[PDB]
Amino acid sequence: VTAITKVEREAVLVCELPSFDVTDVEFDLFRARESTDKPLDVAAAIAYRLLLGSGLPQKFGCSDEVLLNFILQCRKKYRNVPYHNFYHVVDVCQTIHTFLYRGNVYEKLTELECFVLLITALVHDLDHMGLNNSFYLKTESPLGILSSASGNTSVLEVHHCNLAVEILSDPESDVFDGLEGAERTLAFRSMIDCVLATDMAKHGSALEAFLASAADQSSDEAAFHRMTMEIILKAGDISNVTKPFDISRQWAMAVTEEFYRQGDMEKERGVEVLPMFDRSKNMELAKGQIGFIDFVAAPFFQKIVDACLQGMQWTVDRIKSNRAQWERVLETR
Numbered sequence: 001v002t003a004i005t006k007v008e009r010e011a012v013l014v015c016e017l018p019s020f021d022v023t024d025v026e027f028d029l030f031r032a033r034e035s036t037d038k039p040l041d042v043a044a045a046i047a048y049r050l051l052l053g054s055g056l057p058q059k060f061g062c063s064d065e066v067l068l069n070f071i072l073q074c075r076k077k078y079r080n081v082p083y084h085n086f087y088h089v090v091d092v093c094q095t096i097h098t099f100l101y102r103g104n105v106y107e108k109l110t111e112l113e114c115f116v117l118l119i120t121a122l123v124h125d126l127d128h129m130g131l132n133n134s135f136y137l138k139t140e141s142p143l144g145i146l147s148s149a150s151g152n153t154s155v156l157e158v159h160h161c162n163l164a165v166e167i168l169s170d171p172e173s174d175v176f177d178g179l180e181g182a183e184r185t186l187a188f189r190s191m192i193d194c195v196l197a198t199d200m201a202k203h204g205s206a207l208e209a210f211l212a213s214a215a216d217q218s219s220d221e222a223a224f225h226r227m228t229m230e231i232i233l234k235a236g237d238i239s240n241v242t243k244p245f246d247i248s249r250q251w252a253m254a255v256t257e258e259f260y261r262q263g264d265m266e267k268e269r270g271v272e273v274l275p276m277f278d279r280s281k282n283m284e285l286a287k288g289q290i291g292f293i294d295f296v297a298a299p300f301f302q303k304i305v306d307a308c309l310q311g312m313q314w315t316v317d318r319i320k321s322n323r324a325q326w327e328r329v330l331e332t333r
């Protein structure tokens with residue numbers, strides 16, 4: 001609940017980032033982290049410089065100090081877990097920026113929707129513990145019991161939304177305080193809709209709803225704009241396979257460690273451990289990444305690009321080149 005201090009803000013403001021272009025599709029967050037012994041300050045500086053460079057906070061009445069306060073209140077609520085940590089949400093922010101401004105998806109949205117998407121990236125996984133929704137339901141954990149008694153099986157995504165609303169309830173960290181009326185209501189409602197759409201159990205229904213709205217935009221522009229926002233946050237969230245191979249591999253190694261730590265905790269509790277969570281099977285990262293590409297990511301990116309996001313064609317080309325690299329790992333074993 002405590003306010004951000006002047007010392008906390010100066011430690012971010014001093015980071016310079018000399019050799020990096022944070023707007024580039026080949027920006028390497030792993031190298032930016034290695035280039036300093038304060039990587040949490042460098043990650044915060046990347047988010048701050050990307051948002052201020054856009055001119056969007058200035059246009060919407062958000063001061064430089066309220067923006068930095070917001071970034072540092074978000075950083076405080078991420079945990080030291082292998083993948084779902086502050087570096088993941090800064091990476092999703094940076095990646096969404098490239099989709100809007102190098103993929104030209106900004107042409108399909110308002111400037112306010114673009115500002116909301118960059119802000120929502122930073123709140124999307126607040127307080128993640130490296131355990132998925134199925135863990136909380138299968139173990140009858142207290143949060144699983146509350147979800148069940150509530151109605152909603154999106155255990156984590158409702159939790160992330162609750163903490164986003166807490167941060168924004170203080171005017172000193174409220175990046176939407178300069179909005180009023182319909183604009184303020186749209187910022188909150190679109191932020192919450194996008195976070196709830198990141199639950200991978202809704203993946204099929206979110207993709208079908210986007211493709212239907214993209215085929216008939218003028219008959220419901222409100223629905224088309226809302227579904228494009230959901231599909232861009234989702235695209236950012238599964239974007240690791242769209243990156244240069246070595247960046248892609250480092251993310252895959254980090255998600256794999258989280259899956260295995262969940263499996264180990266499921267064994268202690270004597271509950272069912274699905275094979276990809278079982279540290280005892282012969283790991284095999286190339287087989288897992290090819291399966292993720294073939295069943296989830298390749299059909300997602302190819303369909304959204306063919307339906308209307310033509311500027312994002314590089315994502316499809318990189319997924320193909322990364323799949324071919326994983327194939328060669330297997331062919332040379």
Ligand SMILES: COc1ccc(C2=NN(C3CCCCCC3)C(=O)[C@@H]3CC=CC[C@H]23)cc1C#CC(=O)NCc1ccco1
Binds near residue numbers: 198238240
């Ligand atoms: C960098 O690679 C990755 C990035 C991300 C996710 C996420 N998975 N899933 C679900 C859980 C697995 C199956 C259902 C669909 C995907 C999540 O719900 C996570 C939370 C939010 C978004 C995506 C996350 C998984 C991988 C992988 C991998 C891998 O090597 N083998 C696993 C695999 C999956 C399919 C074939 O093989």
Ligand SMILES: [Mg+2]
Binds near residue numbers: 124125156198
């Ligand atoms: Mg999530």
Ligand SMILES: [Zn+2]
Binds near residue numbers: 088
């Ligand atoms: Zn995420």
